[PDB]
Amino acid sequence: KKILIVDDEKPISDIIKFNMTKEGYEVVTAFNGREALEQFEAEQPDIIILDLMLPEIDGLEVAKTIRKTSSVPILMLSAKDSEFDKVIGLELGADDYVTKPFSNRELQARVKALLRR
Ligand code: BEF
Ligand SMILES: [Mn+2]
């Protein structure tokens, strides 16, 4: 299965890529909202882990845009942890929303849960 990791912070992207690689997933990365939409269209990932505070296009806009044509599972992963943040992310189409800092094991379990459908 292929995972697209969207995060503008390379250190965070690297930790998630390391962990998902360990589970046997193919990993593709994007460092801004524009790269996120470009990788989504070119790679057709099976699941997207999506940061919200991103340059060019924010994660909420990336999710809304992607939802116009795809039901690809989206797991939002952000330091933004307010009730409004989680509710709007889910209402715009996210299937799950995890806050930073996060547990690598819990992220792995939620990706498996989403892929399980
Ligand atoms: F920049 Be992400 F929203 F933590
Ligand atoms: Mn960010």
PDB file of all heavy atoms in Angstrom, residues 32-71:
ATOM      1  N   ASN A  32       4.485  20.846   0.962  1.00  0.00           N
ATOM      2  CA  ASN A  32       3.519  21.973   0.937  1.00  0.00           C
ATOM      3  C   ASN A  32       2.216  21.501   0.290  1.00  0.00           C
ATOM      4  O   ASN A  32       2.188  20.414  -0.252  1.00  0.00           O
ATOM      5  CB  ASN A  32       4.115  23.252   0.353  1.00  0.00           C
ATOM      6  CG  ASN A  32       4.315  23.193  -1.143  1.00  0.00           C
ATOM      7  OD1 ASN A  32       3.487  22.687  -1.870  1.00  0.00           O
ATOM      8  ND2 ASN A  32       5.419  23.739  -1.597  1.00  0.00           N
ATOM      9  N   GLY A  33       1.172  22.326   0.366  1.00  0.00           N
ATOM     10  CA  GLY A  33      -0.144  21.960  -0.177  1.00  0.00           C
ATOM     11  C   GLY A  33      -0.138  21.781  -1.679  1.00  0.00           C
ATOM     12  O   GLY A  33      -0.944  21.016  -2.179  1.00  0.00           O
ATOM     13  N   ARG A  34       0.709  22.537  -2.379  1.00  0.00           N
ATOM     14  CA  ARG A  34       0.767  22.400  -3.857  1.00  0.00           C
ATOM     15  C   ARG A  34       1.391  21.045  -4.193  1.00  0.00           C
ATOM     16  O   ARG A  34       0.832  20.318  -4.985  1.00  0.00           O
ATOM     17  CB  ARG A  34       1.596  23.526  -4.476  1.00  0.00           C
ATOM     18  CG  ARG A  34       1.880  23.315  -5.950  1.00  0.00           C
ATOM     19  CD  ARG A  34       2.284  24.627  -6.587  1.00  0.00           C
ATOM     20  NE  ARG A  34       3.421  25.232  -5.927  1.00  0.00           N
ATOM     21  CZ  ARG A  34       3.750  26.508  -6.041  1.00  0.00           C
ATOM     22  NH1 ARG A  34       2.993  27.309  -6.757  1.00  0.00           N
ATOM     23  NH2 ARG A  34       4.822  26.973  -5.442  1.00  0.00           N
ATOM     24  N   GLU A  35       2.515  20.738  -3.552  1.00  0.00           N
ATOM     25  CA  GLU A  35       3.188  19.428  -3.742  1.00  0.00           C
ATOM     26  C   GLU A  35       2.219  18.317  -3.315  1.00  0.00           C
ATOM     27  O   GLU A  35       2.190  17.294  -3.953  1.00  0.00           O
ATOM     28  CB  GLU A  35       4.462  19.357  -2.909  1.00  0.00           C
ATOM     29  CG  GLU A  35       5.547  20.319  -3.345  1.00  0.00           C
ATOM     30  CD  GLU A  35       6.846  20.221  -2.570  1.00  0.00           C
ATOM     31  OE1 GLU A  35       6.911  19.445  -1.639  1.00  0.00           O
ATOM     32  OE2 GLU A  35       7.796  20.904  -2.924  1.00  0.00           O
ATOM     33  N   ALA A  36       1.451  18.552  -2.257  1.00  0.00           N
ATOM     34  CA  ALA A  36       0.487  17.529  -1.801  1.00  0.00           C
ATOM     35  C   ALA A  36      -0.488  17.193  -2.923  1.00  0.00           C
ATOM     36  O   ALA A  36      -0.678  16.054  -3.186  1.00  0.00           O
ATOM     37  CB  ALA A  36      -0.242  17.992  -0.573  1.00  0.00           C
ATOM     38  N   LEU A  37      -1.086  18.193  -3.552  1.00  0.00           N
ATOM     39  CA  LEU A  37      -2.049  17.877  -4.626  1.00  0.00           C
ATOM     40  C   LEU A  37      -1.342  17.264  -5.835  1.00  0.00           C
ATOM     41  O   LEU A  37      -1.927  16.423  -6.471  1.00  0.00           O
ATOM     42  CB  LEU A  37      -2.798  19.151  -5.017  1.00  0.00           C
ATOM     43  CG  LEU A  37      -3.811  19.630  -3.988  1.00  0.00           C
ATOM     44  CD1 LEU A  37      -4.323  21.017  -4.334  1.00  0.00           C
ATOM     45  CD2 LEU A  37      -4.953  18.644  -3.868  1.00  0.00           C
ATOM     46  N   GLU A  38      -0.127  17.703  -6.126  1.00  0.00           N
ATOM     47  CA  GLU A  38       0.591  17.150  -7.297  1.00  0.00           C
ATOM     48  C   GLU A  38       0.918  15.670  -7.053  1.00  0.00           C
ATOM     49  O   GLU A  38       0.727  14.892  -7.952  1.00  0.00           O
ATOM     50  CB  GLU A  38       1.830  17.998  -7.585  1.00  0.00           C
ATOM     51  CG  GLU A  38       1.478  19.345  -8.199  1.00  0.00           C
ATOM     52  CD  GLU A  38       2.593  20.364  -8.333  1.00  0.00           C
ATOM     53  OE1 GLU A  38       3.702  20.115  -7.861  1.00  0.00           O
ATOM     54  OE2 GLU A  38       2.323  21.416  -8.905  1.00  0.00           O
ATOM     55  N   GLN A  39       1.389  15.333  -5.854  1.00  0.00           N
ATOM     56  CA  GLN A  39       1.755  13.929  -5.529  1.00  0.00           C
ATOM     57  C   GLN A  39       0.489  13.077  -5.493  1.00  0.00           C
ATOM     58  O   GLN A  39       0.526  11.948  -5.945  1.00  0.00           O
ATOM     59  CB  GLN A  39       2.485  13.869  -4.192  1.00  0.00           C
ATOM     60  CG  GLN A  39       3.866  14.484  -4.221  1.00  0.00           C
ATOM     61  CD  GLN A  39       4.834  13.723  -5.086  1.00  0.00           C
ATOM     62  OE1 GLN A  39       4.574  12.627  -5.523  1.00  0.00           O
ATOM     63  NE2 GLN A  39       5.973  14.323  -5.345  1.00  0.00           N
ATOM     64  N   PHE A  40      -0.598  13.629  -4.977  1.00  0.00           N
ATOM     65  CA  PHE A  40      -1.862  12.865  -4.928  1.00  0.00           C
ATOM     66  C   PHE A  40      -2.260  12.453  -6.346  1.00  0.00           C
ATOM     67  O   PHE A  40      -2.594  11.309  -6.564  1.00  0.00           O
ATOM     68  CB  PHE A  40      -2.975  13.688  -4.280  1.00  0.00           C
ATOM     69  CG  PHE A  40      -4.370  13.268  -4.658  1.00  0.00           C
ATOM     70  CD1 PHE A  40      -4.892  12.071  -4.212  1.00  0.00           C
ATOM     71  CD2 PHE A  40      -5.164  14.074  -5.449  1.00  0.00           C
ATOM     72  CE1 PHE A  40      -6.173  11.689  -4.560  1.00  0.00           C
ATOM     73  CE2 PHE A  40      -6.446  13.692  -5.790  1.00  0.00           C
ATOM     74  CZ  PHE A  40      -6.941  12.496  -5.349  1.00  0.00           C
ATOM     75  N   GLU A  41      -2.195  13.396  -7.277  1.00  0.00           N
ATOM     76  CA  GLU A  41      -2.625  13.086  -8.660  1.00  0.00           C
ATOM     77  C   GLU A  41      -1.631  12.152  -9.355  1.00  0.00           C
ATOM     78  O   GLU A  41      -2.077  11.301 -10.109  1.00  0.00           O
ATOM     79  CB  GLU A  41      -2.797  14.376  -9.459  1.00  0.00           C
ATOM     80  CG  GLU A  41      -4.087  15.103  -9.129  1.00  0.00           C
ATOM     81  CD  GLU A  41      -5.384  14.318  -9.271  1.00  0.00           C
ATOM     82  OE1 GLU A  41      -5.394  13.284  -9.949  1.00  0.00           O
ATOM     83  OE2 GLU A  41      -6.388  14.750  -8.718  1.00  0.00           O
ATOM     84  N   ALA A  42      -0.340  12.331  -9.118  1.00  0.00           N
ATOM     85  CA  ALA A  42       0.660  11.503  -9.826  1.00  0.00           C
ATOM     86  C   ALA A  42       0.817  10.123  -9.190  1.00  0.00           C
ATOM     87  O   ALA A  42       1.017   9.172  -9.920  1.00  0.00           O
ATOM     88  CB  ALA A  42       1.979  12.211  -9.843  1.00  0.00           C
ATOM     89  N   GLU A  43       0.734  10.050  -7.869  1.00  0.00           N
ATOM     90  CA  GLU A  43       1.021   8.778  -7.174  1.00  0.00           C
ATOM     91  C   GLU A  43      -0.239   7.973  -6.857  1.00  0.00           C
ATOM     92  O   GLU A  43      -0.101   6.781  -6.716  1.00  0.00           O
ATOM     93  CB  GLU A  43       1.849   9.075  -5.928  1.00  0.00           C
ATOM     94  CG  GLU A  43       3.246   9.535  -6.257  1.00  0.00           C
ATOM     95  CD  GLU A  43       4.158   8.436  -6.759  1.00  0.00           C
ATOM     96  OE1 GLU A  43       3.764   7.292  -6.691  1.00  0.00           O
ATOM     97  OE2 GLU A  43       5.239   8.743  -7.195  1.00  0.00           O
ATOM     98  N   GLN A  44      -1.393   8.617  -6.767  1.00  0.00           N
ATOM     99  CA  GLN A  44      -2.645   7.920  -6.387  1.00  0.00           C
ATOM    100  C   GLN A  44      -2.380   7.096  -5.128  1.00  0.00           C
ATOM    101  O   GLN A  44      -2.523   5.894  -5.152  1.00  0.00           O
ATOM    102  CB  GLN A  44      -3.197   7.067  -7.525  1.00  0.00           C
ATOM    103  CG  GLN A  44      -3.688   7.894  -8.700  1.00  0.00           C
ATOM    104  CD  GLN A  44      -3.800   7.103  -9.978  1.00  0.00           C
ATOM    105  OE1 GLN A  44      -4.843   7.088 -10.625  1.00  0.00           O
ATOM    106  NE2 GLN A  44      -2.718   6.455 -10.373  1.00  0.00           N
ATOM    107  N   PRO A  45      -2.072   7.726  -3.985  1.00  0.00           N
ATOM    108  CA  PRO A  45      -1.793   6.980  -2.771  1.00  0.00           C
ATOM    109  C   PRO A  45      -3.046   6.276  -2.243  1.00  0.00           C
ATOM    110  O   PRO A  45      -4.106   6.621  -2.615  1.00  0.00           O
ATOM    111  CB  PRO A  45      -1.334   8.056  -1.785  1.00  0.00           C
ATOM    112  CG  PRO A  45      -1.994   9.312  -2.289  1.00  0.00           C
ATOM    113  CD  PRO A  45      -2.019   9.161  -3.792  1.00  0.00           C
ATOM    114  N   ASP A  46      -2.840   5.298  -1.369  1.00  0.00           N
ATOM    115  CA  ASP A  46      -3.972   4.548  -0.779  1.00  0.00           C
ATOM    116  C   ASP A  46      -4.459   5.283   0.468  1.00  0.00           C
ATOM    117  O   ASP A  46      -5.568   5.045   0.883  1.00  0.00           O
ATOM    118  CB  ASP A  46      -3.541   3.129  -0.413  1.00  0.00           C
ATOM    119  CG  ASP A  46      -3.154   2.320  -1.632  1.00  0.00           C
ATOM    120  OD1 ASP A  46      -4.033   2.043  -2.415  1.00  0.00           O
ATOM    121  OD2 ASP A  46      -1.983   2.019  -1.776  1.00  0.00           O
ATOM    122  N   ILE A  47      -3.610   6.142   1.009  1.00  0.00           N
ATOM    123  CA  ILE A  47      -3.960   6.917   2.226  1.00  0.00           C
ATOM    124  C   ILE A  47      -3.058   8.146   2.301  1.00  0.00           C
ATOM    125  O   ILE A  47      -1.919   8.055   1.894  1.00  0.00           O
ATOM    126  CB  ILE A  47      -3.840   6.024   3.474  1.00  0.00           C
ATOM    127  CG1 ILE A  47      -4.176   6.774   4.762  1.00  0.00           C
ATOM    128  CG2 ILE A  47      -2.471   5.396   3.551  1.00  0.00           C
ATOM    129  CD1 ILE A  47      -4.858   5.926   5.783  1.00  0.00           C
ATOM    130  N   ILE A  48      -3.599   9.246   2.815  1.00  0.00           N
ATOM    131  CA  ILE A  48      -2.799  10.488   2.969  1.00  0.00           C
ATOM    132  C   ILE A  48      -2.738  10.875   4.444  1.00  0.00           C
ATOM    133  O   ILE A  48      -3.764  10.884   5.071  1.00  0.00           O
ATOM    134  CB  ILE A  48      -3.418  11.629   2.140  1.00  0.00           C
ATOM    135  CG1 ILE A  48      -3.643  11.189   0.696  1.00  0.00           C
ATOM    136  CG2 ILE A  48      -2.590  12.894   2.250  1.00  0.00           C
ATOM    137  CD1 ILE A  48      -4.372  12.199  -0.129  1.00  0.00           C
ATOM    138  N   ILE A  49      -1.533  11.109   4.937  1.00  0.00           N
ATOM    139  CA  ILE A  49      -1.343  11.676   6.296  1.00  0.00           C
ATOM    140  C   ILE A  49      -1.147  13.157   6.003  1.00  0.00           C
ATOM    141  O   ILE A  49      -0.243  13.470   5.258  1.00  0.00           O
ATOM    142  CB  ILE A  49      -0.155  11.025   7.016  1.00  0.00           C
ATOM    143  CG1 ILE A  49      -0.411   9.536   7.246  1.00  0.00           C
ATOM    144  CG2 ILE A  49       0.125  11.748   8.318  1.00  0.00           C
ATOM    145  CD1 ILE A  49       0.704   8.825   7.968  1.00  0.00           C
ATOM    146  N   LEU A  50      -1.989  14.004   6.578  1.00  0.00           N
ATOM    147  CA  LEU A  50      -2.005  15.411   6.122  1.00  0.00           C
ATOM    148  C   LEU A  50      -1.841  16.414   7.254  1.00  0.00           C
ATOM    149  O   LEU A  50      -2.733  16.547   8.050  1.00  0.00           O
ATOM    150  CB  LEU A  50      -3.360  15.603   5.441  1.00  0.00           C
ATOM    151  CG  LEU A  50      -3.642  16.968   4.822  1.00  0.00           C
ATOM    152  CD1 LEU A  50      -2.581  17.321   3.800  1.00  0.00           C
ATOM    153  CD2 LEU A  50      -4.999  16.953   4.173  1.00  0.00           C
ATOM    154  N   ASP A  51      -0.745  17.155   7.193  1.00  0.00           N
ATOM    155  CA  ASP A  51      -0.475  18.306   8.091  1.00  0.00           C
ATOM    156  C   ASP A  51      -1.376  19.466   7.624  1.00  0.00           C
ATOM    157  O   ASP A  51      -1.801  19.444   6.502  1.00  0.00           O
ATOM    158  CB  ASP A  51       1.017  18.640   8.067  1.00  0.00           C
ATOM    159  CG  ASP A  51       1.462  19.792   8.951  1.00  0.00           C
ATOM    160  OD1 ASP A  51       0.964  19.897  10.063  1.00  0.00           O
ATOM    161  OD2 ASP A  51       2.285  20.559   8.489  1.00  0.00           O
ATOM    162  N   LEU A  52      -1.643  20.438   8.489  1.00  0.00           N
ATOM    163  CA  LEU A  52      -2.569  21.535   8.113  1.00  0.00           C
ATOM    164  C   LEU A  52      -1.800  22.835   7.885  1.00  0.00           C
ATOM    165  O   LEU A  52      -2.051  23.468   6.898  1.00  0.00           O
ATOM    166  CB  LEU A  52      -3.622  21.702   9.204  1.00  0.00           C
ATOM    167  CG  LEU A  52      -4.500  20.479   9.413  1.00  0.00           C
ATOM    168  CD1 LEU A  52      -5.443  20.697  10.571  1.00  0.00           C
ATOM    169  CD2 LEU A  52      -5.251  20.112   8.159  1.00  0.00           C
ATOM    170  N   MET A  53      -0.925  23.198   8.805  1.00  0.00           N
ATOM    171  CA  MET A  53      -0.127  24.429   8.592  1.00  0.00           C
ATOM    172  C   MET A  53       0.947  24.104   7.554  1.00  0.00           C
ATOM    173  O   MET A  53       1.958  23.527   7.919  1.00  0.00           O
ATOM    174  CB  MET A  53       0.514  24.913   9.891  1.00  0.00           C
ATOM    175  CG  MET A  53      -0.504  25.136  10.976  1.00  0.00           C
ATOM    176  SD  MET A  53       0.180  26.024  12.373  1.00  0.00           S
ATOM    177  CE  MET A  53       0.776  27.483  11.526  1.00  0.00           C
ATOM    178  N   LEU A  54       0.673  24.466   6.306  1.00  0.00           N
ATOM    179  CA  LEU A  54       1.592  24.198   5.174  1.00  0.00           C
ATOM    180  C   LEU A  54       1.750  25.456   4.324  1.00  0.00           C
ATOM    181  O   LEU A  54       0.789  26.176   4.162  1.00  0.00           O
ATOM    182  CB  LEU A  54       0.926  23.191   4.241  1.00  0.00           C
ATOM    183  CG  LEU A  54       0.742  21.761   4.733  1.00  0.00           C
ATOM    184  CD1 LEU A  54      -0.172  21.025   3.780  1.00  0.00           C
ATOM    185  CD2 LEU A  54       2.073  21.052   4.861  1.00  0.00           C
ATOM    186  N   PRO A  55       2.909  25.668   3.672  1.00  0.00           N
ATOM    187  CA  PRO A  55       3.056  26.761   2.720  1.00  0.00           C
ATOM    188  C   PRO A  55       2.191  26.495   1.486  1.00  0.00           C
ATOM    189  O   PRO A  55       1.729  25.404   1.327  1.00  0.00           O
ATOM    190  CB  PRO A  55       4.525  26.669   2.288  1.00  0.00           C
ATOM    191  CG  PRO A  55       5.199  26.009   3.454  1.00  0.00           C
ATOM    192  CD  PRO A  55       4.174  24.998   3.922  1.00  0.00           C
ATOM    193  N   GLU A  56       1.978  27.548   0.696  1.00  0.00           N
ATOM    194  CA  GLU A  56       1.245  27.526  -0.593  1.00  0.00           C
ATOM    195  C   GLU A  56      -0.252  27.283  -0.425  1.00  0.00           C
ATOM    196  O   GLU A  56      -1.027  28.152  -0.791  1.00  0.00           O
ATOM    197  CB  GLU A  56       1.867  26.514  -1.550  1.00  0.00           C
ATOM    198  CG  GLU A  56       3.274  26.874  -1.960  1.00  0.00           C
ATOM    199  CD  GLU A  56       3.442  28.255  -2.572  1.00  0.00           C
ATOM    200  OE1 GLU A  56       2.511  28.742  -3.204  1.00  0.00           O
ATOM    201  OE2 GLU A  56       4.510  28.803  -2.417  1.00  0.00           O
ATOM    202  N   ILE A  57      -0.631  26.091   0.018  1.00  0.00           N
ATOM    203  CA  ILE A  57      -2.061  25.720   0.189  1.00  0.00           C
ATOM    204  C   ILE A  57      -2.154  25.018   1.539  1.00  0.00           C
ATOM    205  O   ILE A  57      -1.344  24.167   1.773  1.00  0.00           O
ATOM    206  CB  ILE A  57      -2.505  24.785  -0.946  1.00  0.00           C
ATOM    207  CG1 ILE A  57      -2.095  25.317  -2.317  1.00  0.00           C
ATOM    208  CG2 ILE A  57      -3.988  24.484  -0.870  1.00  0.00           C
ATOM    209  CD1 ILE A  57      -2.703  24.567  -3.462  1.00  0.00           C
ATOM    210  N   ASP A  58      -3.082  25.423   2.393  1.00  0.00           N
ATOM    211  CA  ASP A  58      -3.156  24.763   3.718  1.00  0.00           C
ATOM    212  C   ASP A  58      -3.837  23.400   3.592  1.00  0.00           C
ATOM    213  O   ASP A  58      -4.550  23.177   2.629  1.00  0.00           O
ATOM    214  CB  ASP A  58      -3.801  25.655   4.771  1.00  0.00           C
ATOM    215  CG  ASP A  58      -5.279  25.846   4.551  1.00  0.00           C
ATOM    216  OD1 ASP A  58      -5.975  24.859   4.353  1.00  0.00           O
ATOM    217  OD2 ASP A  58      -5.707  26.986   4.585  1.00  0.00           O
ATOM    218  N   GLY A  59      -3.613  22.547   4.594  1.00  0.00           N
ATOM    219  CA  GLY A  59      -4.156  21.182   4.624  1.00  0.00           C
ATOM    220  C   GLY A  59      -5.661  21.139   4.518  1.00  0.00           C
ATOM    221  O   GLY A  59      -6.172  20.243   3.880  1.00  0.00           O
ATOM    222  N   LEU A  60      -6.353  22.089   5.138  1.00  0.00           N
ATOM    223  CA  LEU A  60      -7.830  22.069   5.031  1.00  0.00           C
ATOM    224  C   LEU A  60      -8.215  22.239   3.565  1.00  0.00           C
ATOM    225  O   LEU A  60      -9.073  21.529   3.093  1.00  0.00           O
ATOM    226  CB  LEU A  60      -8.421  23.184   5.896  1.00  0.00           C
ATOM    227  CG  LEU A  60      -8.259  23.024   7.402  1.00  0.00           C
ATOM    228  CD1 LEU A  60      -8.876  24.200   8.131  1.00  0.00           C
ATOM    229  CD2 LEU A  60      -8.911  21.737   7.885  1.00  0.00           C
ATOM    230  N   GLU A  61      -7.557  23.169   2.879  1.00  0.00           N
ATOM    231  CA  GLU A  61      -7.855  23.396   1.445  1.00  0.00           C
ATOM    232  C   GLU A  61      -7.435  22.174   0.633  1.00  0.00           C
ATOM    233  O   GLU A  61      -8.123  21.835  -0.304  1.00  0.00           O
ATOM    234  CB  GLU A  61      -7.166  24.666   0.950  1.00  0.00           C
ATOM    235  CG  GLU A  61      -7.883  25.905   1.413  1.00  0.00           C
ATOM    236  CD  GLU A  61      -9.350  25.808   1.058  1.00  0.00           C
ATOM    237  OE1 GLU A  61      -9.634  25.652  -0.133  1.00  0.00           O
ATOM    238  OE2 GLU A  61     -10.193  25.840   1.980  1.00  0.00           O
ATOM    239  N   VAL A  62      -6.326  21.544   1.012  1.00  0.00           N
ATOM    240  CA  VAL A  62      -5.885  20.332   0.270  1.00  0.00           C
ATOM    241  C   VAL A  62      -6.970  19.264   0.409  1.00  0.00           C
ATOM    242  O   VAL A  62      -7.338  18.676  -0.568  1.00  0.00           O
ATOM    243  CB  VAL A  62      -4.534  19.815   0.796  1.00  0.00           C
ATOM    244  CG1 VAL A  62      -4.206  18.443   0.248  1.00  0.00           C
ATOM    245  CG2 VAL A  62      -3.406  20.783   0.516  1.00  0.00           C
ATOM    246  N   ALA A  63      -7.461  19.059   1.625  1.00  0.00           N
ATOM    247  CA  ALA A  63      -8.474  18.009   1.852  1.00  0.00           C
ATOM    248  C   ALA A  63      -9.760  18.320   1.086  1.00  0.00           C
ATOM    249  O   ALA A  63     -10.269  17.434   0.443  1.00  0.00           O
ATOM    250  CB  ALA A  63      -8.727  17.853   3.329  1.00  0.00           C
ATOM    251  N   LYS A  64     -10.246  19.553   1.186  1.00  0.00           N
ATOM    252  CA  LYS A  64     -11.488  19.946   0.471  1.00  0.00           C
ATOM    253  C   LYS A  64     -11.289  19.718  -1.029  1.00  0.00           C
ATOM    254  O   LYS A  64     -12.133  19.111  -1.660  1.00  0.00           O
ATOM    255  CB  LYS A  64     -11.829  21.406   0.781  1.00  0.00           C
ATOM    256  CG  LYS A  64     -13.002  21.956  -0.011  1.00  0.00           C
ATOM    257  CD  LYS A  64     -13.591  23.209   0.557  1.00  0.00           C
ATOM    258  CE  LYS A  64     -14.619  23.790  -0.380  1.00  0.00           C
ATOM    259  NZ  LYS A  64     -13.983  24.261  -1.632  1.00  0.00           N
ATOM    260  N   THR A  65     -10.153  20.161  -1.554  1.00  0.00           N
ATOM    261  CA  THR A  65      -9.878  19.992  -2.996  1.00  0.00           C
ATOM    262  C   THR A  65      -9.885  18.517  -3.371  1.00  0.00           C
ATOM    263  O   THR A  65     -10.547  18.156  -4.313  1.00  0.00           O
ATOM    264  CB  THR A  65      -8.544  20.634  -3.377  1.00  0.00           C
ATOM    265  OG1 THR A  65      -8.666  22.027  -3.122  1.00  0.00           O
ATOM    266  CG2 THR A  65      -8.157  20.353  -4.809  1.00  0.00           C
ATOM    267  N   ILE A  66      -9.157  17.695  -2.610  1.00  0.00           N
ATOM    268  CA  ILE A  66      -9.052  16.246  -2.916  1.00  0.00           C
ATOM    269  C   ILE A  66     -10.436  15.603  -2.861  1.00  0.00           C
ATOM    270  O   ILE A  66     -10.727  14.776  -3.702  1.00  0.00           O
ATOM    271  CB  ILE A  66      -8.069  15.562  -1.949  1.00  0.00           C
ATOM    272  CG1 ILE A  66      -6.620  15.884  -2.309  1.00  0.00           C
ATOM    273  CG2 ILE A  66      -8.318  14.066  -1.930  1.00  0.00           C
ATOM    274  CD1 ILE A  66      -5.611  15.312  -1.359  1.00  0.00           C
ATOM    275  N   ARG A  67     -11.273  16.028  -1.920  1.00  0.00           N
ATOM    276  CA  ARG A  67     -12.621  15.417  -1.739  1.00  0.00           C
ATOM    277  C   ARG A  67     -13.550  15.694  -2.932  1.00  0.00           C
ATOM    278  O   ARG A  67     -14.570  15.030  -3.029  1.00  0.00           O
ATOM    279  CB  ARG A  67     -13.242  15.850  -0.412  1.00  0.00           C
ATOM    280  CG  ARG A  67     -12.773  15.015   0.772  1.00  0.00           C
ATOM    281  CD  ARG A  67     -13.299  13.605   0.753  1.00  0.00           C
ATOM    282  NE  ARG A  67     -12.704  12.838   1.832  1.00  0.00           N
ATOM    283  CZ  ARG A  67     -11.653  12.058   1.700  1.00  0.00           C
ATOM    284  NH1 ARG A  67     -11.101  11.885   0.523  1.00  0.00           N
ATOM    285  NH2 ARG A  67     -11.155  11.430   2.751  1.00  0.00           N
ATOM    286  N   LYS A  68     -13.182  16.626  -3.813  1.00  0.00           N
ATOM    287  CA  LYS A  68     -14.025  16.911  -5.006  1.00  0.00           C
ATOM    288  C   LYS A  68     -13.950  15.721  -5.954  1.00  0.00           C
ATOM    289  O   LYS A  68     -14.918  15.477  -6.654  1.00  0.00           O
ATOM    290  CB  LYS A  68     -13.533  18.161  -5.737  1.00  0.00           C
ATOM    291  CG  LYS A  68     -13.877  19.471  -5.054  1.00  0.00           C
ATOM    292  CD  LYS A  68     -13.287  20.677  -5.723  1.00  0.00           C
ATOM    293  CE  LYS A  68     -13.481  21.929  -4.901  1.00  0.00           C
ATOM    294  NZ  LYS A  68     -12.597  23.030  -5.347  1.00  0.00           N
ATOM    295  N   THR A  69     -12.851  14.980  -5.941  1.00  0.00           N
ATOM    296  CA  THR A  69     -12.742  13.874  -6.914  1.00  0.00           C
ATOM    297  C   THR A  69     -12.386  12.539  -6.268  1.00  0.00           C
ATOM    298  O   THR A  69     -12.491  11.534  -6.960  1.00  0.00           O
ATOM    299  CB  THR A  69     -11.673  14.204  -7.960  1.00  0.00           C
ATOM    300  OG1 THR A  69     -10.424  14.374  -7.298  1.00  0.00           O
ATOM    301  CG2 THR A  69     -11.996  15.464  -8.727  1.00  0.00           C
ATOM    302  N   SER A  70     -12.006  12.520  -4.993  1.00  0.00           N
ATOM    303  CA  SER A  70     -11.544  11.220  -4.454  1.00  0.00           C
ATOM    304  C   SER A  70     -12.058  10.959  -3.041  1.00  0.00           C
ATOM    305  O   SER A  70     -12.210  11.900  -2.296  1.00  0.00           O
ATOM    306  CB  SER A  70     -10.053  11.191  -4.439  1.00  0.00           C
ATOM    307  OG  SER A  70      -9.593   9.941  -3.987  1.00  0.00           O
ATOM    308  N   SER A  71     -12.270   9.685  -2.734  1.00  0.00           N
ATOM    309  CA  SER A  71     -12.671   9.243  -1.382  1.00  0.00           C
ATOM    310  C   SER A  71     -11.450   8.606  -0.714  1.00  0.00           C
ATOM    311  O   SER A  71     -11.626   7.829   0.197  1.00  0.00           O
ATOM    312  CB  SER A  71     -13.809   8.287  -1.448  1.00  0.00           C
ATOM    313  OG  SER A  71     -13.425   7.103  -2.112  1.00  0.00           O
TER     314      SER A  71
END
